[PDB]
Write a protein that binds this DNA or RNA. Structure first.
Lengths: 108, 105
DNA sequence: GGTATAATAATTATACT
DNA sequence: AGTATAATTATTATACC
């Protein structure tokens, strides 16, 4: 029967965007990006979806929202060590994806 | 500018939904990576039969879990992790190790 | 070993600043 | 660098057999 830690982990992983967002941040310089970077490179995410996800990720303490006192002010999203570790745990998923997924496949 | 892998993206279409990762992991720890409908329903604790059925059809389309008909005396219906499904299950171990170290609970 | 029907929760579309 | 309103999907809650 089922690992309740794994159950908990899918409460974030088993929803839209979370996995892709933490993977994207793990690849950025300093593991950080602005709202507009993520919207641009995630391609099909809406601003409202991106805002909600970032806020849930901040609650899960996977992503940190930092106010930077530059002029004008910058707002950057940065992976926590906990988030960075989760990002590492996704590499073999990436590997599986490049081995087994065919993008031409059709489904209902 | 810092593009996302399309294959990873496609993978999250299954993983980034309710139940799919849990079902694939469950099936990976069953004898012969096989289970009956009621087995999964009982062991997943809180899944509705309709969510289970939908998800099993979803996973069949991805060719992750095959629904097999064993034409015995009363017919048995078995859901079976494919080799592709087994590889996915394996690739979920480091996530489970991360959960151990970080999740609270 | 599941389906039918109905309601809720998650996600997206659009528009806007 | 995000919010607002409304629609559309995804998921669940009950029944039922």
């Amino acid at each position: 029967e089922v690992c309740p830690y794994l159950e908990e982990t899918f409460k974030i992983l088993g929803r839209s965007w979370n996995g892709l967002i933490i993977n994207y941040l793990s690849r950025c310089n300093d593991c950080s990006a602005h709202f507009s970077d993520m919207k641009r490179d995630l391609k099909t995410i809406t601003p409202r979806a991106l805002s909600l996800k970032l806020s849930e990720l901040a609650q899960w303490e996977l992503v940190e929202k930092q106010i930077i006192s530059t002029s004008p002010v910058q707002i950057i999203y940065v992976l926590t060590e906990k988030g960075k570790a989760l990002a590492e745990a996704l590499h073999p998923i990436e590997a599986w994806a490049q081995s087994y997924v065919d993008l031409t496949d059709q489904r209902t």
